[PDB]
Amino acid sequence: LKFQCGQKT
Amino acid sequence: IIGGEFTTIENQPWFAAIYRRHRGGSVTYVCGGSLMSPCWVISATHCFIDYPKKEDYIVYLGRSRLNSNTQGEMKFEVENLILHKDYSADTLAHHNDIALLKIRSKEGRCAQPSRTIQTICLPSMYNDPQFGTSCEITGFGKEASTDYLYPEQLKMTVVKLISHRECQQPHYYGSEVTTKMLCAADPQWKTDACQGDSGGPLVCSLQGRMTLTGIVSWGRGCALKDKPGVYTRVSHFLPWIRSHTK
Numbered sequence: 001l002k003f004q005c006g007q008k009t
Numbered sequence: 010i011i012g013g014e015f016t017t018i019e020n021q022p023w024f025a026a027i028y029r030r031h032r033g034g035s036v037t038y039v040c041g042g043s044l045m046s047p048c049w050v051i052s053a054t055h056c057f058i059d060y061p062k063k064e065d066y067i068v069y070l071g072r073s074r075l076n077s078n079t080q081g082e083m084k085f086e087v088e089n090l091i092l093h094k095d096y097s098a099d100t101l102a103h104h105n106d107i108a109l110l111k112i113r114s115k116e117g118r119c120a121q122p123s124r125t126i127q128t129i130c131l132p133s134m135y136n137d138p139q140f141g142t143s144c145e146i147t148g149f150g151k152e153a154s155t156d157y158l159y160p161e162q163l164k165m166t167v168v169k170l171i172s173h174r175e176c177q178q179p180h181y182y183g184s185e186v187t188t189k190m191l192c193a194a195d196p197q198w199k200t201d202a203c204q205g206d207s208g209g210p211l212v213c214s215l216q217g218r219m220t221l222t223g224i225v226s227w228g229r230g231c232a233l234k235d236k237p238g239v240y241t242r243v244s245h246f247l248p249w250i251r252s253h254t255k
């Protein structure tokens with residue numbers, strides 16, 4: 001989706 | 010990385026792999042880097058200093074391997090290469106070893122978010138984790154100081170932040186280490202970054218976010234007793250970063 005710094009998925 | 014485990018980019022989705030093109034056909038790996046915003050990657054100035062021709066560098070995001078492709082990877086050209094005015098190298102140390110690369114793809118775009126491409130968070134002004142915090146580092150650098158090849162699979166390891174008092178002890182690095190650098194080592198001097206890991210990230214959780222706390226810069230040897238790895242202290246360069254990434 002859009003970037004969310006530091007979140008790994 | 011000496012020690013560590015082999016991983017995949019999904020476990021470090023902000024890691025950027027930078028290579029250099031040669032006349033003759035080969036492209037070689039240069040350094041690691043990190044994605045801070047869609048169009049900006051941060052690395053270390055000494056990685057480019059001796060060959061500052063932006064047109065010959067290629068940046069890849071979403072890569073778990075060094076010379077083979079990974080599905081999902083993105084390839085970019087370097088639109089702007091910003092080195093740090095005041096970068097300095099002496100025996101062992103590199104001062105102000107931070108650099109910015111603005112990336113653009115052949116279609117004219119910046120990075121797109123996926124399970125293999127994510128940005129890392131920046132610390133707040135002069136804010137760092139306390140020493141003792143465990144942070145992770147990643148890269149394609151050597152696995153043993155005596156090797157002459159880099160691994161094909163990405164590696165990661167955990168290291169702990171140590172204090173400047175401990176790092177500036179004469180029998181460690183003395184005054185070579187400044188307030189604009191950070192030191193990290195393994196309590197038992199077993200794992201560490203090594204040649205080939207320069208420019209990549211030192212990530213720690215800060216205020217609930219996985220934050221870019223350091224950039225792999227130098228170290229005497231790799232995993233040597235009393236010779237911690239030294240990193241650029243990103244929290245002390247936030248005005249500089251801002252100055253170009255605005």
Ligand SMILES: NC(=[NH2+])c1ccc2[nH]c(-c3cccc(-c4ccccc4)c3[O-])cc2c1
Binds near residue numbers: 039230232237239
């Ligand atoms: N022991 C450590 N903690 C450590 C970390 C990063 C390093 N990078 C290097 C390094 C050595 C020779 C050349 C480069 C270099 C120079 C120009 C372009 C790219 C890499 C290095 O980053 C050593 C080195 C050692």
